[PDB]
Amino acid sequence: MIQPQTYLEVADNTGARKIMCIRVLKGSNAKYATVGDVIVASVKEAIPRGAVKEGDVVKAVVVRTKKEIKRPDGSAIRFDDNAAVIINNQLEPRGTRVFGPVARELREKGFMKIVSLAPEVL
Amino acid sequence: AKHPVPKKKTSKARRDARRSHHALTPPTLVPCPECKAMKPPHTVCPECGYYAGRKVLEV
Amino acid sequence: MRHLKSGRKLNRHSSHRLALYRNQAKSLLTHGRITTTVPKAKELRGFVDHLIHLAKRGDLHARRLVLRDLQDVKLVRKLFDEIAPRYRDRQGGYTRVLKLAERRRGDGAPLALVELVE
Amino acid sequence: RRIRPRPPRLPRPRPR
Amino acid sequence: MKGILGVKVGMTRIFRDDRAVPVTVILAGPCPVVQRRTPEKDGYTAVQLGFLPQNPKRVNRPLKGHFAKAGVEPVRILREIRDFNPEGDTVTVEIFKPGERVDVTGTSKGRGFAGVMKRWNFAGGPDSHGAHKIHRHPGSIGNRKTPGRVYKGKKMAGHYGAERVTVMNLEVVDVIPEENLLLVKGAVPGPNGGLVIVRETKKA
Amino acid sequence: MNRGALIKLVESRYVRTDLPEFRPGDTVRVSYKVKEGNRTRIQDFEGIVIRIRRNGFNTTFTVRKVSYGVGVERIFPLHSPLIQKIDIVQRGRARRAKLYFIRNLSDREIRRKLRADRKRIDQDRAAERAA
RNA sequence: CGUGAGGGAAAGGUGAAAAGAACCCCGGGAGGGGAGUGAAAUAGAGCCUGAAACCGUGGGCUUACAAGCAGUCACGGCCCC
RNA sequence: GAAUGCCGGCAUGAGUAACGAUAAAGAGGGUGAGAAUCCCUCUCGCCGUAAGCCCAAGGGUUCCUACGCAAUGGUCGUCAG
RNA sequence: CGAUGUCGGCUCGUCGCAUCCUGGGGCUGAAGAAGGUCCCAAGGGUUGGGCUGUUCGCCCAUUAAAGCGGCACGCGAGCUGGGUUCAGAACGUCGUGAGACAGUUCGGUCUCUAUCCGCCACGGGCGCAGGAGGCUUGAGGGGGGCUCUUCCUAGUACGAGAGGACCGGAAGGGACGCACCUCUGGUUUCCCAGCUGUCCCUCCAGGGGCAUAAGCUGGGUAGCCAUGUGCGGAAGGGAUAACCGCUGAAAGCAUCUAAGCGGGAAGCCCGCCCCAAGAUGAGGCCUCCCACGGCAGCCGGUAAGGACCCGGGAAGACCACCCGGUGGAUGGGCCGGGGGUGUAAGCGCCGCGAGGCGUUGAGCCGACCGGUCCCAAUCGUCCGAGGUCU
Ligand SMILES: [K+]
Ligand SMILES: [Mg+2]
Ligand SMILES: [Mg+2]
Ligand SMILES: [Mg+2]
Ligand SMILES: [Mg+2]
Ligand SMILES: [Mg+2]
Ligand SMILES: [Mg+2]
Ligand SMILES: [Mg+2]
Ligand SMILES: [Mg+2]
Ligand SMILES: [Mg+2]
Ligand SMILES: [Mg+2]
Ligand SMILES: [Mg+2]
Ligand SMILES: [Mg+2]
Ligand SMILES: [Mg+2]
Ligand SMILES: [Mg+2]
Ligand SMILES: [Mg+2]
Ligand SMILES: [Mg+2]
Ligand SMILES: [Mg+2]
Ligand SMILES: [Mg+2]
Ligand SMILES: [Mg+2]
Ligand SMILES: [Mg+2]
Ligand SMILES: [Mg+2]
Ligand SMILES: [Mg+2]
Ligand SMILES: [Mg+2]
Ligand SMILES: [Mg+2]
Ligand SMILES: [Mg+2]
Ligand SMILES: [Mg+2]
Ligand SMILES: [Mg+2]
Ligand SMILES: [Mg+2]
Ligand SMILES: [Mg+2]
Ligand SMILES: [Mg+2]
Ligand SMILES: [Mg+2]
Ligand SMILES: [Mg+2]
Ligand SMILES: [Mg+2]
Ligand SMILES: [Mg+2]
Ligand SMILES: [Mg+2]
Ligand SMILES: [Mg+2]
Ligand SMILES: [Mg+2]
Ligand SMILES: [Mg+2]
Ligand SMILES: [Mg+2]
Ligand SMILES: [Mg+2]
Ligand SMILES: [Mg+2]
Ligand SMILES: [Mg+2]
Ligand SMILES: [Mg+2]
Ligand SMILES: [Mg+2]
Ligand SMILES: [Mg+2]
Ligand SMILES: [Mg+2]
Ligand SMILES: [Mg+2]
Ligand SMILES: [Mg+2]
Ligand SMILES: [Mg+2]
Ligand SMILES: [Mg+2]
Ligand SMILES: [Mg+2]
Ligand SMILES: [Mg+2]
Ligand SMILES: [Mg+2]
Ligand SMILES: [Mg+2]
Ligand SMILES: [Mg+2]
Ligand SMILES: [Mg+2]
Ligand SMILES: [Mg+2]
Ligand SMILES: [Mg+2]
Ligand SMILES: [Mg+2]
Ligand SMILES: [Mg+2]
Ligand SMILES: [Mg+2]
Ligand SMILES: [Mg+2]
Ligand SMILES: [Mg+2]
Ligand SMILES: [Mg+2]
Ligand SMILES: [Mg+2]
Ligand SMILES: [Mg+2]
Ligand SMILES: [Mg+2]
Ligand SMILES: [Mg+2]
Ligand SMILES: [Mg+2]
Ligand SMILES: [Mg+2]
Ligand SMILES: [Mg+2]
Ligand SMILES: [Mg+2]
Ligand SMILES: [Mg+2]
Ligand SMILES: [Mg+2]
Ligand SMILES: [Mg+2]
Ligand SMILES: [Mg+2]
Ligand SMILES: [Mg+2]
Ligand SMILES: [Mg+2]
Ligand SMILES: [Mg+2]
Ligand SMILES: [Mg+2]
Ligand SMILES: [Mg+2]
Ligand SMILES: [Mg+2]
Ligand SMILES: [Mg+2]
Ligand SMILES: [Mg+2]
Ligand SMILES: [Mg+2]
Ligand SMILES: [Mg+2]
Ligand SMILES: [Mg+2]
Ligand SMILES: [Mg+2]
Ligand SMILES: [Mg+2]
Ligand SMILES: [Mg+2]
Ligand SMILES: [Mg+2]
Ligand SMILES: [Mg+2]
Ligand SMILES: [Mg+2]
Ligand SMILES: [Mg+2]
Ligand SMILES: [Mg+2]
Ligand SMILES: [Mg+2]
Ligand SMILES: [Mg+2]
Ligand SMILES: [Mg+2]
Ligand SMILES: [Mg+2]
Ligand SMILES: [Mg+2]
Ligand SMILES: [Mg+2]
Ligand SMILES: [Mg+2]
Ligand SMILES: [Mg+2]
Ligand SMILES: [Mg+2]
Ligand SMILES: [Mg+2]
Ligand SMILES: [Mg+2]
Ligand SMILES: [Mg+2]
Ligand SMILES: [Mg+2]
Ligand SMILES: [Mg+2]
Ligand SMILES: [Mg+2]
Ligand SMILES: [Mg+2]
Ligand SMILES: [Mg+2]
Ligand SMILES: [Mg+2]
Ligand SMILES: [Mg+2]
Ligand SMILES: [Mg+2]
Ligand SMILES: [Mg+2]
Ligand SMILES: [Mg+2]
Ligand SMILES: [Mg+2]
Ligand SMILES: [Mg+2]
Ligand SMILES: [Mg+2]
Ligand SMILES: [Mg+2]
Ligand SMILES: [Mg+2]
Ligand SMILES: [Mg+2]
Ligand SMILES: [Mg+2]
Ligand SMILES: [Mg+2]
Ligand SMILES: [Mg+2]
Ligand SMILES: [Mg+2]
Ligand SMILES: [Mg+2]
Ligand SMILES: [Mg+2]
Ligand SMILES: [Mg+2]
Ligand SMILES: [Mg+2]
Ligand SMILES: [Mg+2]
Ligand SMILES: [Mg+2]
Ligand SMILES: [Mg+2]
Ligand SMILES: [Mg+2]
Ligand SMILES: [Mg+2]
Ligand SMILES: [Mg+2]
Ligand SMILES: [Mg+2]
Ligand SMILES: [Mg+2]
Ligand SMILES: [Mg+2]
Ligand SMILES: [Mg+2]
Ligand SMILES: [Mg+2]
Ligand SMILES: [Mg+2]
Ligand SMILES: [Mg+2]
Ligand SMILES: [Mg+2]
Ligand SMILES: [Mg+2]
Ligand SMILES: [Mg+2]
Ligand SMILES: [Mg+2]
Ligand SMILES: [Mg+2]
Ligand SMILES: [Mg+2]
Ligand SMILES: [Mg+2]
Ligand SMILES: [Mg+2]
Ligand SMILES: [Mg+2]
Ligand SMILES: [Mg+2]
Ligand SMILES: [Mg+2]
Ligand SMILES: [Mg+2]
Ligand SMILES: [Mg+2]
Ligand SMILES: [Mg+2]
Ligand SMILES: [Mg+2]
Ligand SMILES: [Mg+2]
Ligand SMILES: [Mg+2]
Ligand SMILES: [Mg+2]
Ligand SMILES: [Mg+2]
Ligand SMILES: [Mg+2]
Ligand SMILES: [Mg+2]
Ligand SMILES: [Mg+2]
Ligand SMILES: [Mg+2]
Ligand SMILES: [Mg+2]
Ligand SMILES: [Mg+2]
Ligand SMILES: [Mg+2]
Ligand SMILES: [Mg+2]
Ligand SMILES: [Mg+2]
Ligand SMILES: [Mg+2]
Ligand SMILES: [Mg+2]
Ligand SMILES: [Mg+2]
Ligand SMILES: [Mg+2]
Ligand SMILES: [Mg+2]
Ligand SMILES: [Mg+2]
Ligand SMILES: [Mg+2]
Ligand SMILES: [Mg+2]
Ligand SMILES: [Mg+2]
Ligand SMILES: [Mg+2]
Ligand SMILES: [Mg+2]
Ligand SMILES: [Mg+2]
Ligand SMILES: [Mg+2]
Ligand SMILES: [Mg+2]
Ligand SMILES: [Mg+2]
Ligand SMILES: [Mg+2]
Ligand SMILES: [Mg+2]
Ligand SMILES: [Mg+2]
Ligand SMILES: [Mg+2]
Ligand SMILES: [Mg+2]
Ligand SMILES: [Mg+2]
Ligand SMILES: [Mg+2]
Ligand SMILES: [Mg+2]
Ligand SMILES: [Mg+2]
Ligand SMILES: [Mg+2]
Ligand SMILES: [Mg+2]
Ligand SMILES: [Mg+2]
Ligand SMILES: [Mg+2]
Ligand SMILES: [Mg+2]
Ligand SMILES: [Mg+2]
Ligand SMILES: [Mg+2]
Ligand SMILES: [Mg+2]
Ligand SMILES: [Mg+2]
Ligand SMILES: [Mg+2]
Ligand SMILES: [Mg+2]
Ligand SMILES: [Mg+2]
Ligand SMILES: [Zn+2]
């Protein structure tokens, strides 16, 4: 449950540390994004000399949410933060790594590259 | 609010037509099988102190 | 809405409703019969019946439980010694409520007696 | 949408 | 156009192909037909259905006459299924098979005098910034001198629920003839122990 | 009619009795069936059970672990056919039925706060001696 | 009423005569019903006359598919003389 | 017949809003024509840098006791400034 | 002018169509895709944020689109009170001055009670020619009506290439609506536990009050809920709009038309869900009651039946509605299960002690699913047809 104003940790080596969502890309007026949704966000904080800097307007896919997400098998899964991975307009990651686990929902939604890059898929 | 207030005095006819539902209904009473006195059903007879065919309470 | 909720509020806040049930039970386990309003009467049935049942068990735990509501060591003793035993074979229903025929003058409240069963 | 602002014609009412 | 009377019993979820399916259990059979309506006699086609046994003491005389003409034991409720003619004298769950797609009518939960926010999902008033004893009020209900009245139909507070609601196109997950049990996928109007009607869906 | 009974009846065909009992505070390994591309596999989840909601057949339990620097919680229905087995890896001792509070503790504090429930350990070893 | 200067009301009538109703009855009392006084008691003291607004009981006519400055003109029904 | 006229009487709104701190009550016993409301007992709750106690102002018999309940008391009253 | 409250916002909408999108078209300087332009169409839809009192506008990010207007520039007896009409104070400017300025600045009292119409809900009455208990028909109303992406067809038709379809067929979404509580997530005023200060019971142990109208803290059933779940928009049938025809005169040709017949919209009528015979035009079916007495009428007692009274209820402001009233499981108690809490008191052992271990998943235990006549629904009373005329 990510919406405009929501901060996210970035889970990659692009150089951003925190991005703040300003728009969820899922139709004309989707209220929330979840795992596997592409958001548009501003970069609020970054490390020196990254591929990205504070102030940019970038796109990212949400990989972990703190509101638990439900699955067809009757289970659920939930992470301790809300994080995302920055992308280009081809749904490909922009960094060369991703940190921490990511949700298996990403695979189903076609963010294949990210899933293999992830240390664990839960 | 702006202090609503009646626009016209109510006609005798219309005040009394509002009261068309104000009549009391007579109390509902049954004889007591012991002392034959009229009493509310499901209550202890306040005349002779009987309810359910036994003396319950000192009248 | 109030769907499937159990137990009246009796226009008393939480701790006052509580003292009410206690003081009623105190009065009831003392005189064996009292008069109250009908709603008050119906609510007392359960509250006392539970205490009486605990006297029937007789153990130490039971006494200390009961003593939380009733508070009076003498009265508890009476409940345990005199009251309880005359219910050893009675399985629930240790009290009865019967409705009185005349309302109160000052407020028209329907009255009823509540008493301990023979 | 009337382009010229229209004056109030009654004061904000006071206890007077 | 087949139908049956039943009772709502409660919800759970079962497992079917590594999937959890929310379901509602309804006790449907058996329902004896106790009158049939024909175009000659009544103008249309239906089957009057009966459901749940009744203490014959509690069934008055005009009603006793009605059952006896059917060859039928006294029953708690009568309801019709329209445009329906089962060949038997009794209808059971056997008329629906898993996979079939049904409609169910129930009597909705009653919320009594409901406010405008619960009933019609109005937005209420703001909760600070000066909002003044209007936090759950409806706001304007009109215009001014034109039209100078309130439309019929205008959404306002009033009773809500305790009314006939039909939910349509539910998947039949299972049927257990040995218990007169019907497992429909999804949520059914009304409280547990409530009366319902289950028909073949009017959806394609 | 007995409405509760009817429910449990419908439910009964899915009820499992084969899984081990466990308490909140215990550390557990849940072998869960998972699908990906294109196959299905067994993926283990190992953590502390921090909560056990009870509703008969609808009882569900919640397990928490730290994976590569991030806290993860998993919720499982206890009679899910998708669970292969659950292995008790350690008995722990809570004084509390729901353990939400460990979400804010360090790995050190948790170890102090949830000591090994030595009683249920001997108890687990008392069995595990077959005939 | 106003600190004060000062402001500033309402409120008349039993009967010729109290002969102002002993006494009994219901009622805690109030009040009443009888008895009694009187030419008269809807002259009974909450008292000459006792208008109108206003409230009530009883009786005739009338009214629950009807659109109204409330009346008027016509006709018919019912009730009274 | 009108002067938002004057004095008085009586309506309408209406059996409606309200009955003045959300510190809180319950039972038993007594008294009496009548009792949730007076007295008595027991239980519960509230104030305690007061919601206790003593002075000054101001009020002027409100003090104590007996006998009362038309009115005053926001209900009731057998109680009472 | 013995008062018609005034900008903007919020709230709630409803209407117009000169249509922003979605549907149907003609022309194109229409290859395809995508546009331009006019015609038809008001069914539905038409986002979030920065600035400013703003409406407007500009900008950011999206979108199928981010339409324009009317309703006292809709809506202050519905809210706001930032704008602007009072009294204070200051700046620039004008005036000798008092003061003033479509010049600016800071501050500045927005009225518990709805009589009538109207609206949303709910009853009482009478009627619907015999009186009744059920089950219904649907005149007529209301609700609803949105739309995107990707894939296959097919990298095909088209095009030098870049690009890229009609038609048809699958899958997944957004917002909205109705219902629901199995899961997920809330609340859960006393269902459990821990904790402090103080007063108390009864000294220890064990408890009780108060610290809020829960003292605080960790939890939490049923219910009521959304953030959670199911489902809906249609399909289809008919009639049309613009537009395209077939056959075809007047008018030897031509013409969609003058006679006749086709195709054709998210729109219209039906279909779907809800209300509905006060539909006084008061409908229909099934079943029960009976032609009782005294004087289209009155009176008395009854019939079928109903009400009163009572125990209640996911029904509910009262009312109504539904269930039950000893021939009974309606509530309360009690027993069992679930469920919460998470190992009671007491005793034994270990430690100087705070404590720790065992007995013990113990003790306690609202509402949930059930059982059981232990307690209470005693006993009863009153209404209630004798059927108008051709
Ligand atoms: K001015
Ligand atoms: Mg910067
Ligand atoms: Mg106002
Ligand atoms: Mg008002
Ligand atoms: Mg106000
Ligand atoms: Mg007012
Ligand atoms: Mg007025
Ligand atoms: Mg009058
Ligand atoms: Mg009158
Ligand atoms: Mg009126
Ligand atoms: Mg309700
Ligand atoms: Mg409430
Ligand atoms: Mg109940
Ligand atoms: Mg309680
Ligand atoms: Mg209740
Ligand atoms: Mg009250
Ligand atoms: Mg009280
Ligand atoms: Mg409370
Ligand atoms: Mg308290
Ligand atoms: Mg208290
Ligand atoms: Mg009784
Ligand atoms: Mg009194
Ligand atoms: Mg009574
Ligand atoms: Mg139904
Ligand atoms: Mg509201
Ligand atoms: Mg709603
Ligand atoms: Mg809502
Ligand atoms: Mg809002
Ligand atoms: Mg606001
Ligand atoms: Mg709000
Ligand atoms: Mg204010
Ligand atoms: Mg105010
Ligand atoms: Mg407020
Ligand atoms: Mg206005
Ligand atoms: Mg207005
Ligand atoms: Mg008009
Ligand atoms: Mg209702
Ligand atoms: Mg199956
Ligand atoms: Mg239910
Ligand atoms: Mg259940
Ligand atoms: Mg069974
Ligand atoms: Mg793995
Ligand atoms: Mg003066
Ligand atoms: Mg003076
Ligand atoms: Mg003067
Ligand atoms: Mg004078
Ligand atoms: Mg004289
Ligand atoms: Mg004289
Ligand atoms: Mg006398
Ligand atoms: Mg006397
Ligand atoms: Mg006298
Ligand atoms: Mg008298
Ligand atoms: Mg006299
Ligand atoms: Mg004489
Ligand atoms: Mg003479
Ligand atoms: Mg006279
Ligand atoms: Mg005279
Ligand atoms: Mg006089
Ligand atoms: Mg004279
Ligand atoms: Mg006179
Ligand atoms: Mg007079
Ligand atoms: Mg007169
Ligand atoms: Mg009269
Ligand atoms: Mg008509
Ligand atoms: Mg008529
Ligand atoms: Mg006219
Ligand atoms: Mg004429
Ligand atoms: Mg005449
Ligand atoms: Mg004149
Ligand atoms: Mg005046
Ligand atoms: Mg006047
Ligand atoms: Mg006037
Ligand atoms: Mg005057
Ligand atoms: Mg005059
Ligand atoms: Mg005057
Ligand atoms: Mg006057
Ligand atoms: Mg009056
Ligand atoms: Mg009233
Ligand atoms: Mg009123
Ligand atoms: Mg009121
Ligand atoms: Mg007052
Ligand atoms: Mg009131
Ligand atoms: Mg008071
Ligand atoms: Mg008070
Ligand atoms: Mg308070
Ligand atoms: Mg007393
Ligand atoms: Mg007494
Ligand atoms: Mg009293
Ligand atoms: Mg009295
Ligand atoms: Mg006293
Ligand atoms: Mg002190
Ligand atoms: Mg002095
Ligand atoms: Mg004085
Ligand atoms: Mg004096
Ligand atoms: Mg003295
Ligand atoms: Mg004195
Ligand atoms: Mg004194
Ligand atoms: Mg005295
Ligand atoms: Mg007095
Ligand atoms: Mg008196
Ligand atoms: Mg006196
Ligand atoms: Mg007084
Ligand atoms: Mg008084
Ligand atoms: Mg007073
Ligand atoms: Mg008095
Ligand atoms: Mg006295
Ligand atoms: Mg006094
Ligand atoms: Mg004016
Ligand atoms: Mg005026
Ligand atoms: Mg005027
Ligand atoms: Mg005025
Ligand atoms: Mg005015
Ligand atoms: Mg047009
Ligand atoms: Mg188009
Ligand atoms: Mg094209
Ligand atoms: Mg081209
Ligand atoms: Mg075009
Ligand atoms: Mg055209
Ligand atoms: Mg439209
Ligand atoms: Mg419209
Ligand atoms: Mg529009
Ligand atoms: Mg802002
Ligand atoms: Mg803004
Ligand atoms: Mg703006
Ligand atoms: Mg601002
Ligand atoms: Mg501007
Ligand atoms: Mg476009
Ligand atoms: Mg915009
Ligand atoms: Mg508009
Ligand atoms: Mg306008
Ligand atoms: Mg305006
Ligand atoms: Mg306005
Ligand atoms: Mg205002
Ligand atoms: Mg305004
Ligand atoms: Mg106004
Ligand atoms: Mg107005
Ligand atoms: Mg409002
Ligand atoms: Mg202002
Ligand atoms: Mg400005
Ligand atoms: Mg100003
Ligand atoms: Mg000023
Ligand atoms: Mg200045
Ligand atoms: Mg200057
Ligand atoms: Mg100058
Ligand atoms: Mg100068
Ligand atoms: Mg000037
Ligand atoms: Mg100037
Ligand atoms: Mg000016
Ligand atoms: Mg200037
Ligand atoms: Mg300035
Ligand atoms: Mg300002
Ligand atoms: Mg200020
Ligand atoms: Mg205000
Ligand atoms: Mg009022
Ligand atoms: Mg009114
Ligand atoms: Mg009017
Ligand atoms: Mg009616
Ligand atoms: Mg009625
Ligand atoms: Mg027909
Ligand atoms: Mg109509
Ligand atoms: Mg229709
Ligand atoms: Mg329609
Ligand atoms: Mg291709
Ligand atoms: Mg779809
Ligand atoms: Mg549940
Ligand atoms: Mg839940
Ligand atoms: Mg759950
Ligand atoms: Mg939960
Ligand atoms: Mg407790
Ligand atoms: Mg407590
Ligand atoms: Mg303590
Ligand atoms: Mg101690
Ligand atoms: Mg204390
Ligand atoms: Mg205290
Ligand atoms: Mg307190
Ligand atoms: Mg919680
Ligand atoms: Mg809590
Ligand atoms: Mg719960
Ligand atoms: Mg939701
Ligand atoms: Mg169609
Ligand atoms: Mg057609
Ligand atoms: Mg041609
Ligand atoms: Mg031709
Ligand atoms: Mg020619
Ligand atoms: Mg033609
Ligand atoms: Mg055609
Ligand atoms: Mg045509
Ligand atoms: Mg064609
Ligand atoms: Mg459509
Ligand atoms: Mg219907
Ligand atoms: Mg009818
Ligand atoms: Mg009907
Ligand atoms: Mg008509
Ligand atoms: Mg009929
Ligand atoms: Mg009730
Ligand atoms: Mg009944
Ligand atoms: Mg009976
Ligand atoms: Mg019986
Ligand atoms: Mg029972
Ligand atoms: Mg029970
Ligand atoms: Mg259990
Ligand atoms: Mg358990
Ligand atoms: Mg232990
Ligand atoms: Mg122990
Ligand atoms: Mg020792
Ligand atoms: Mg249990
Ligand atoms: Mg219990
Ligand atoms: Mg039995
Ligand atoms: Mg009797
Ligand atoms: Zn008697």
Residues F33-61 as b/e (b if ≥16 CB within 10 A, e otherwise) read: ebeeeeeeeeeebebbbbbbeeeebbebb
Structure tokens at B47: 């005349």
Structure tokens at B51: 């309810």
Residues 6+ apart with CB under 8 A from A10: A16, A17, A18, A19, A60, A83, A84, A85, A86
Give me the sign of the Cα torsion angle A12, A16, A21, A24. Answer: negative
Q: How much distance in Å is there from the Cα of C68 to the middle of ligand 169?
A: 10
Tell me chain A's radius of gyration from C-alpha atoms: 13
Strands C111-116 and C95-99, how do they pair?
antiparallel
Q: Is E105 exposed, middle or buried (0-12, 13-18, 19+ CB in 10 A)?
A: buried
E27 CA: distance to closest CA in chain C (Å): 22
- Rounded Cα distance, F67 and A20, in Å: 24
Helix axes C14-31, C60-70, angle to 10 degrees: 110
Q: How far is CA F104 from CA C96, F52, F74, F100, in A?
A: 54, 19, 17, 8
Question: A-contacting residues of F 41-100, CB under 8 Å?
Answer: 43, 45, 67-77, 80, 82
Structure tokens at E127: 């909760």
- Rounded Cα distance, E8 and A6, in Å: 43
Please report, rounded to whole angstroms, the spatial distance between the CA atom of protein residue E157 and the C1' atom of nucleotide I177.
18
Structure determined by:
X-ray
Q: Which domains does chain C have, with CATH numbers?
A: 14-118 (3.90.1030.10)
- Rounded Cα distance, A72 and A84, in Å: 23
Please report, rounded to whole angstroms, the spatial distance between the CA atom of protein residue A107 and the C1' atom of nucleotide I50.
36
Q: Is the CB of E159 inside 8 Å of chain C's CB atoms? A: no
**Contact call for residues E199 and E103 (beta carbons, < 8 A):** yes
Residue C22 host element (H or E)? helix C14-31
| Residues shown for chain B | 59
Q: Are E14 and F11 a contacting pair at CB < 8 A?
A: yes
Structure tokens at E75: 């029953």
- Against chain F, the chains showing at least 3 CB pairs within 8 Å are A, E
Beta-carbon neighbour count of residue A100 at 10 Å? 22
| Residues whose Cβ atom is located within 5 A of ion ligand 37 | E 159, 162
**Contact call for residues E85 and E45 (beta carbons, < 8 A):** yes
**Contact call for residues A122 and A101 (beta carbons, < 8 A):** yes
Residues just before a chain gap in chain D (C–N exceeding 2.5 Å) are none
Resolution (A): 2.8
B12 touches strand G (CB under 7 A): yes
- Rounded Cα distance, A97 and F51, in Å: 34
- Rounded Cα distance, A54 and A42, in Å: 8
Helix (H/G/I), strand (E/B), else coil: C7: coil
Q: How much distance in Å is there from the Cα of F4 to the middle of ligand 100?
A: 62
Residues from chain A that touch E18, judged by Cβ atoms under 8 A, are 72-73
- Rounded Cα distance, C27 and C38, in Å: 16
Residues 6+ apart with CB under 8 A from B49: B55, B56, B57, B58, B59
Tell me chain F's radius of gyration from C-alpha atoms: 17
Structure tokens at E79: 């309801």
- Against chain D, the chains showing at least 3 CB pairs within 8 Å are none
Our answer on whether A and D touch (3+ beta-carbon pairs < 8 Å) is no
B36: left (phi over 0), alpha (psi -120 to 50) or beta: left
